[model samples]
Target: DNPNNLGDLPEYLRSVGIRQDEGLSEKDWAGTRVYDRNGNDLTDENQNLLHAIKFDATTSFYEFFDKETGESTGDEGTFFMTAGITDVSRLVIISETKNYQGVYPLRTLYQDTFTYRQMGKDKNGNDIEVFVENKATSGPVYGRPQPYPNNRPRTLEFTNGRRAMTEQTGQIDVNRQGDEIIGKTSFDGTPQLLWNGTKVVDKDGNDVTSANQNFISLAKFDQDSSKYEFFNLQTGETRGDYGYFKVGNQNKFRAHVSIGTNRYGAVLELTELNDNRFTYTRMGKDNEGNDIQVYVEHEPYQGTFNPEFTF
Candidate 1:
């Protein structure tokens, strides 16, 4: 049942250039209600009910009702469609609150996987395009909204503009108990090296670093000059020609490669020094002889074998 009234929200909506035939108003729907995360019924005279929404030419607008009484709740805000309207996507609402209690403030709401409908008319006077049902994944969220990565290159640079180091190349020589044991276990367990989509192989012509998560196989251990190696499990071929892998002072990892066009450069930079799974960057060249850098983030690699695939 539609307990909430249309009120003047529909009139104001039309005055703002919203067409009645477009079906943006709640009056166009039946039994539409708003509920919080707890599933408490928020349908009231003017409480928490989404009254009107306008997807204007430039800016989007939305109005939600009072949390208390309808006396002084004119909560309105500007919204942006993170995804397209009338589809299954996200909507961000930045709201300004006005209270008779003398507190005026702002809050953000994220309607994740939000869905809305728009009914249009056809030449035969019938409903032509009926959009998806009106639905929001959650009620109003109360905080700053986090920005989506949107395919941006993840950088280790801090908010204060400082970059993190993987490990140091030059240091002292030291050994610890069970260093060889852990190294052999990890190396034996992981007989395959898959990096960024390709198979990585290590050769016997030379050898391998630290106690860090990026550590695959520790060939020799010196506080400053620890060596590591990687091999392709399928091919069973490992040599020194691929790259010189080692660990730094902080137990982080770095892969140094010397090749044709680019004489030498560090290929791997791992921010996580002690852990096995990390978010790191892979820097190298492409077939066109251009530089390419990729940050293989840990968040997106969950539930995948790439996280277990070393160096």
Candidate 2:
């Protein structure tokens, strides 16, 4: 954590070299110390450590992952997310280096619950079941608190400077329609999908719809050929396909578009505003490779990414 925040004295003292400045009383430094949010251990927001981990994050929280390998690693095995920080897909760390860096994208696995069972058939009757899995609930434990309160759809402006409301408040811009993005405008005016009810032009504006067996497939979406060919972030399949992204069992807001891609797979979930405009935001790595979330209106990104960010 940066030493500048939490309080000003820590930084002030560091620069002054800890000689015990006269004007500042000794009690100021000696008596003040930062600890857990509430009290401590048993008295701090919970009865004990277990509840902290089992309940909200604030207290017992630390997830780690290999930025290099992108795999979950270390002590707690990486999924313990805490609220407040930016969403970097897995809140991963460089396992080999162990540095909490190499920011990834964001994906919400929403707080959810499911069941455990084994399927089998009974003697001459019906089916028998076996319960073999876990907790009453599972998933994220953070509230990604908004810096302020307002409803002007804003997005993280990677190349633009860092999405924020104003220059100082932090990037959050008034974006497009439905998804509230605000990126590329429309000349969708006509480069529009030329469809023959069966055939449709994709990226390059050529027909690649499935009806003619000319559908856009990962195999083809790669090159600069058929305008219709694109990718699918979910199934690892080069989709070359669709969706508006609803909160299904996955509890996610997904969409199928090949307009953008982040460090990982940059998925630009698009929500059409009107015939004249549309918006997009980089959701995260499209479970696929470093593919494009392309046409992208990125807002899901709070303050964590910037493809053009200084390396």
Which numbered prediction scores highest in TM-score against the true structure?
1
User: Runs in model 2 with CA error above 4 Å?
Assistant: 1-112, 116-240, 243-266, 269-275, 279-311
lDDT by residue for model 2 over 147-213, one digit each (tens)? 6643322111111211121111113222211111222113221111211112222333332332223
Q: TM-score per candidate, in order? A: 0.22, 0.19
Question: What tens-digit string does per-residue lDDT give for candidate 1 at 216-281?
Answer: 321221111112333332343342323222232223333333222323334244443221323344
Model 2: how far residue 218 lies from native, Å: 18
Displacement of the residue 171 alpha carbon in candidate 2, Å: 13
lDDT of 2: 0.22
lDDT of each: 0.27, 0.22
Q: Any runs in candidate 1 off by more than 4 Å, and if so which?
A: 1-225, 239-244, 252-267, 273-275, 284-292, 296-311
